[PDB]
Every structure is written in C-alpha cells, then in structure tokens.
C-alpha cells in the first residue's frame, strides 16, 4: 500500500464524481475508502452546508488553510474517522479548486496530502493494523 497512490486515486474519484477528469488487494482499500468518504460526506452535509461553501479558498492561502484545518483535526488524536475526514477535506479543496477556476492547485493539494500521510499519519496507521484494518473496520458498513 502506497500513500501517494491512495491520495491520487481518491482525488481522481472525487473529481470524476463532479464531472471533472483529472490525470488487486490494493484495489480493495481504494474502493473501501471511496465508499467511506461518500458516507462521511452524506453524514456531514446532513448536519452542515456543503463544505465547499465554507472554504474561502484562494491560491495564496490554500496551503495555510490546508495545514491549519488538518493540524487541528489531528491535534488531540488520530482515529479512522478523522482519517476519513482528512481525505474528504482534501477532496473538497480539490473540488473547490476546480470550481473556482484554479485547477492546478489540485496537484499541490495532492502533494500536501501525501506529505501529511507519509509524515504524520503513517505511525498511527501502522500501529493500528494498517490499511487492512481500515478495510476490516469499515466492512460491515459497505453497501
């Protein structure tokens, strides 16, 4: 399981979901994360507006807004739900980038997400059973 592949495939899906095209055991994790992110986004929007509208995204502030939100997300701890929240948040930034006519920002966001996965989330993930444990945990929620 390679974290850069995981990020690129997730972002690709999030964008194709919106009508935007953007350039097997491992397949199981991608497909599971797909459904978990869609389920997260459904629950989120039931309680809140479309996340996209509460961003105030600009090319100048994009990295600082990414780092501030993600730092606070994981400040008091990690769990699989917060990791799912991290992937959806990064997907929303990518989607909003395309919407607001800054599509090259997507490539930076994907890099920031890979960096954060490799540098700050890799330890908890490995200590907690790896991605196979996410697949195991999310199993009964698949539809």
């Amino acid at each position: 399981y390679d974290n850069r592949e995981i990020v690129m495939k997730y972002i690709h899906y999030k964008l194709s979901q919106r009508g935007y095209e953007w350039d097997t055991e491992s397949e199981v994790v991608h497909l599971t994360l797909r459904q978990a992110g869609d389920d997260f986004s459904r629950r989120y929007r039931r309680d809140f507006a479309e996340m996209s509208s509460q961003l105030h995204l600009t090319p100048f502030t994009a990295r600082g807004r990414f780092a501030t939100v993600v730092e606070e997300l994981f400040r008091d701890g990690v769990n699989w739900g917060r990791i799912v929240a991290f992937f959806e948040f990064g997907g929303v930034m990518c989607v909003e980038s395309v919407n607001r006519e800054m599509s090259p920002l997507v490539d930076n966001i994907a890099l920031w997400m890979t960096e954060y996965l490799n540098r700050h989330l890799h330890t908890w993930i490995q200590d907690n059973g790896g991605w196979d444990a996410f697949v195991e945990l999310y199993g009964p929620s698949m539809r």
Binding site: R43, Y44, L73, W80, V84, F86, E88, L137
Partner: peptide, 22 residues
C-alpha cells in the same frame, strides 16, 4: 472559520468512528 471547519470535521469524524466501530 477554519476553526469552525476543523471542529465540524472532527465531530463528524468521531461520529463516523463510533458508528463504523460497532
């Protein structure tokens, strides 16, 4: 408002974590 966004993400994430975990 980035704090507002982060706390909304965390609450949904923890909810998601509780629900999918039994």
């Amino acid at each position: 408002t980035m704090e507002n966004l982060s706390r909304r993400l965390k609450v949904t994430g923890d909810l998601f974590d509780i629900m999918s975990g039994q």
